[PDB]
Design a binder for this molecule. Structure first.
Ligand SMILES: OC[C@H]1O[C@H](O)[C@H](O)[C@@H](O)[C@@H]1O
Lengths: 729, 303, 304
């Protein structure tokens, strides 16, 4: 109320020093109701100043001057100067105009996208301000669409400068926090647009077990329902709510079998053709909606209609949930048209997410992005990406940049959805990224040739995919703790580099590089390997400090930008001196919570990690070479400790503390072994290999080893040898 | 024509000659003002070198040592002495690596890969230092030639190359710091020994004369036109040449036919990054491979 | 005028600003009180220190509550205010639409340093006469970004000397100075010769200036002003008349290294033409490719 100012037909609410709501009302009434985007305008009071005259008003905070000259909002009447110097003359917002500096957000979908597509703006800007227009409908108390806002213009001016994390936290306070995911969502999902039988699906699930690949989720795509069995007078088989009985003669029994294998089960739902007269639930729906059954009147999709939504959840989904379906894959691609003006995809995500909470605690959906605030309905489903290096090269940037509009749970089809071209190396690189993405869901097109099964590929590719898929389940504790941090504290699992390093120009120059939780920095390789090196590469920016390759221990002295090379089976993931990462020791075990945690410690500095769980909190501290583990509640959990290289403690129960000062701090990784391996795999001349090995062995001074490699005629081989010299310096 | 004259000046004989064409005269003023001035400077340098050449000539005749030696005469067991076909020793004090390839128009500089034997080497003209043993690509403007002297080198130069003198009335003793050395100047009617031993420079002759000696220690003229035999202490004289990384970096970026954004970024990053290994890591990311090599030469010399 | 500025206390008093809340005198050229404080209390003290005229350097858009382009208000009001301190005074500012020739000089701004930019500029300059904006001042040698090429800098200065205004300017780079001695001895001497030639041309330029002001004739004319019915007068975009006695065909392409010369296709109207510098003759009417060393520029005068 002191944070509220009316002037002419406008209303201004100073929510934080850095966040102002700006409204216009012809009627003099302004909007207090929630909207599709905004769930909460309750914020603690803040200091600001006002200069009010007859004709004009200026609102002044620590970061912004907002001016209003009266009348209708125009670029001339409503504008703001930030109190920052990030630019020479892009420090002014004008109503209705775009400025430079927006770091972007996300978009609905990657359907049919081969590589890059345009993104919407987010709330983050290098120049320190962004405007988020609220164009949505108002809600009722219980979250039904109520109609048009009486605030016919309703904007949020963000003026956080480059405090991106606080901008995002306050956005979550305005639009509501992301809910907690359930632990099962963070495991591997299996999916394929393939007409499995109950028998061939269970045989595939048992082959995953036999192949030592853990799964959390069993997706059944659209061939679960009638497709070619649909008479053409009704249109296509794309939408379906009736089991194909040939393939699934006893659905509940099939779902019981997946449940006995400790899998959660989801079905594809294409809702757009509604419930037509051939469907199994049609007689019930027709009775509830008073349809003309002798004229075979369809229950057309209509999520604006309360009776339709009830029949959809109770009489269409209800019978399938009773057969054991755990959650819904909402797969909408049929446009944004409704008589209400609300995007049907928005109505589906909002209502289905709420309905999912009835059957299961912290339940999810799987659906496309439905605009600002739709993070309240995880998980994101990016859809029909084209299978290409260009698509993979876009995806890490896409994923990290989405955190800028608070949409932090994108599930991409890992390996790409459709079209494009076969390349087992592309499939393996894509799975490496997926394992270090918010969700790891293997999925593919209707092709006989696009299965993401590891054993589709040669023995090298298969073993590497199996190792990465196991690593995903090892990461579930770290992922689930970051998930609770997203839900409780408004911090993204995947952050662009500029969230941690806002003032470092290099944090804006590595689009595909990101922080993954608080302990790991990932630089996926998204380019086909150089056949002369038998290695792929990516330019990595190393922030100030000592960094270790998470897998090898190879060290890097920051701050530096350095091209790094990896075999197709290895991924650039880095941890700082002092990093502590927990890993499940038993990733193949079907355990609700890990019976055994490996604490992986990176030497050379202090650190700590807080492991949040369903029913506990465990703190791991590393302070002057003393490692301590405590928990809120006690348990039988057995702790394993790995300090750099060496397993120090194995399966020790309860709370404890152990001194690692005089333990071996150094990893195995050495310049000589790594040099030999890189030269050995290279498809270069044996004379060159022999000369490089002899000269780098005989030349003692680091500066002369570098001078030697600088004479090499292969420019990319120079860069690979320079990486090793830089790490071995 | 200019690169060829640079080599000629550091060859056994410097004879300008050409065909019956109206278009092939080797007159310096045939060419533009830049080329003309550089040819005139090299042609004057040849006459400055006559004392050094004539002493090497008497050594050829009396001792059977060539003025021009392949690297493998001095370094028979070093494989790199067999891999620099155009590199040679010129007398006992100078090592020459002529540039014999058209300049890279993006750098406005020509280059040659130089093998530096064990020891500290100085560019004879600039003082730019090099720590041997190393093989390093070196870049020069078209007006400059890679000629190198070791720490301790003493080269005599005629001070009056334009004078029509039977023997020089005045010798400049050019001394390269950081080690002991000596040079014996053989002449028609004399022998003059120049010795540099724990920072003491001594000149003696077999016979006496009116000859006036000038001394240049690295950068600085220490003595001017002093007659007869003498000895002078250079220990607490300035040993370091002027050549510096910053000036050389600015000059290379300024002449380059590259983008001004690239110039600005390279100048700012190499000025702001303090650790030598990170300056090298920075230049290693450059998309221009030959510009990397040019910047690496400067970092190597400035290390 | 923000609270840290030296004239702020005076402006704040005149505009009744809240100084304890450090209320800015925001730019507002629609406002008579703002314009007066700007000319009297902001420019005024600098003019008393000796500033002769104003470089108005506006790049912040066309937004005003009046709907009048702020650049238009600046050029109209500053040009008028400049006449108080000096007779026939000028500004230096961007083009503000038809009629803004009343407020010379034009300032074209932040061109990219490239052969492509130089290749555009003569056409740009001559074509502007078609909306009566005859005093464009371009940054000679180009403003920013682009790439180093001493030959581009020399060709650009040749055009500049035969342009309405010869203003050397460049970016914040340590590497973009237009000083002649930045370049090698050949380039330096040629730049010095062209810069001296500009001052030799001042009588011819000042007489054409009075003709612009009294008779409405541009200094720089496209060929089709003199030769409206000749198809070739529409096919030499970079060729122009410079006053009434000279025809200029600048070279705006990098030299052919095999010839050590640049070239341009010149249309010679009916009559006998001489290269202004060399006397080399040409019998019109003909279209002919002409070659010059980097130090020489194609400028032609008729018999008489
Ligand atoms: O259900 C069949 C297909 O429908 C749509 O194209 C979905 O986006 C895709 O994920 C699915 O496999």
């Amino acid at each position: 109320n002191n944070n509220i100012i009316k002037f002419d037909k406008a209303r201004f609410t100073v929510l934080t020093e850095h966040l102002i709501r700006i409204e216009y009302s012809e009627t003099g009434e302004f909007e207090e109701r929630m909207t599709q985007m905004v769930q909460n305008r309750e914020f603690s009071e803040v200091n600001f100043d006002i200069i009010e005259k007859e004709e004009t008003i200026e609102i002044i905070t620590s970061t912004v001057h907002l001016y209003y000259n009266g009348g209708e909002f125009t670029n001339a009447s409503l504008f703001a100067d930030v109190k920052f110097n990030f630019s020479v003359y892009s420090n002014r917002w004008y109503f209705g105009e775009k400025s430079d500096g927006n770091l972007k957000g996300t978009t609905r979908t990657l359907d049919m996208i081969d590589g890059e597509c345009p993104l919407e703006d987010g709330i983050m800007s290098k120049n320190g301000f962004a405007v988020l227009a609220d164009k949505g409908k108002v809600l009722t108390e219980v979250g039904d669409i109520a109609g048009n806002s009486v605030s016919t213009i309703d904007l949020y001016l963000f003026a956080y400068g480059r405090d991106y994390r606080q901008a995002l936290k306050d956005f979550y306070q305005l639009t509501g926090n992301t809910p907690k995911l359930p632990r099962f969502a963070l495991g591997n999902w299996w999916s394929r647009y393939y007409d499995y039988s109950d028998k061939s699906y269970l045989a595939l699930m048992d082959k995953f077990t036999d192949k030592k690949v853990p799964l959390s989720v069993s997706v059944i795509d659209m061939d679960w329902h009638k497709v070619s069995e649909v008479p053409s007078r009704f249109g296509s088989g794309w939408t379906g709510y009736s089991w194909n009985k040939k393939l699934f003669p006893n659905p509940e029994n099939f779902i019981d079998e997946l449940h006995q294998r400790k899998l959660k089960v989801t079905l594809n739902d294409h809702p757009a053709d509604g419930i037509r007269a051939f469907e199994d639930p049609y007689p019930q729906v027709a009775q509830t909606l008073d349809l003309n059954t002798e004229l075979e009147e369809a229950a057309k999709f209509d999520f604006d209609n309360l009776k339709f939504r009830k029949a959809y959840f109770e009489e269409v989904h209800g019978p399938l949930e009773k057969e054991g379906v755990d959650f819904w894959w909402i797969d909408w691609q049929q446009g944004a048209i409704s008589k209400s003006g609300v995007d049907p995809l928005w109505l589906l995500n909002h209502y289905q997410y709420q309905n999912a909470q009835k059957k299961h605690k912290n339940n999810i959906i799987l659906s496309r992005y439905a605009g600002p605030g739709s993070h309240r309905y995880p998980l994101g489903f990016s859809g029909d990406s084209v299978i290409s290096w260009a698509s993979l090269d876009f995806q890490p940037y896409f994923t990290s940049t989405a955190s800028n509009i608070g949409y932090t749970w994108w599930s991409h089809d890992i390996g790409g959805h459709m079209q494009g071209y076969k390349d087992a190396e592309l499939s393996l690189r894509w799975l490496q990224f997926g394992v270090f993405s918010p969700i790891n869901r293997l999925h593919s097109s209707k092709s006989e040739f696009t299965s993401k099964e590891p054993w589709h590929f040669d023995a090298v590719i298969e073993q590497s995919m199996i190792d990465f898929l196991q690593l995903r389940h090892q990461l579930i504790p770290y992922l689930y703790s970051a998930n609770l941090i997203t839900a409780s504290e408004g911090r993204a699992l995947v952050e662009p580099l500029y969230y941690e390093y806002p003032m470092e120009e290099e944090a804006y120059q590595h689009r595909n590089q990101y922080l993954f939780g608080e302990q790991l920095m990932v630089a996926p390789i998204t380019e086909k390997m150089n056949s002369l090196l038998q290695m792929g590469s990516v330019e990595v920016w190393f922030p100030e400090g000592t960094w270790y390759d998470f897998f090898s221990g190879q060290p890097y002295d920051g701050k530096v930008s350095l091209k790094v090379y990896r075999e197709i089976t290895e991924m650039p993931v880095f941890a700082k001196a002092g990093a502590i990462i927990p890993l499940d020791k038993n990733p193949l075990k079907k355990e609700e919570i890990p019976s055994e945690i490996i604490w992986k410690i990176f030497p050379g500095a202090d650190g700590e990690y807080l492991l949040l769980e369903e029913d506990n909190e465990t703190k791991a501290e590393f302070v002057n070479g003393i490692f301590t583990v405590t928990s809120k509640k006690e348990s039988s959990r057995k702790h394993t400790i790995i300090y750099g290289e060496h397993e120090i403690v194995s399966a020790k129960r309860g709370e404890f503390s152990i001194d690692l000062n005089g333990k071996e701090e150094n990893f195995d990784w050495n310049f000589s072994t790594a040099l030999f391996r890189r030269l050995d795999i290279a498809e270069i001349s044996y004379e060159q290999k022999d000369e490089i090995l002899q000269q780098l062995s005989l030349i003692e001074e680091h500066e002369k080893q570098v001078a030697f490699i600088k004479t090499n005629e292969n420019q990319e081989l120079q860069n690979s040898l320079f990486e090793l010299l830089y790490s071995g310096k």
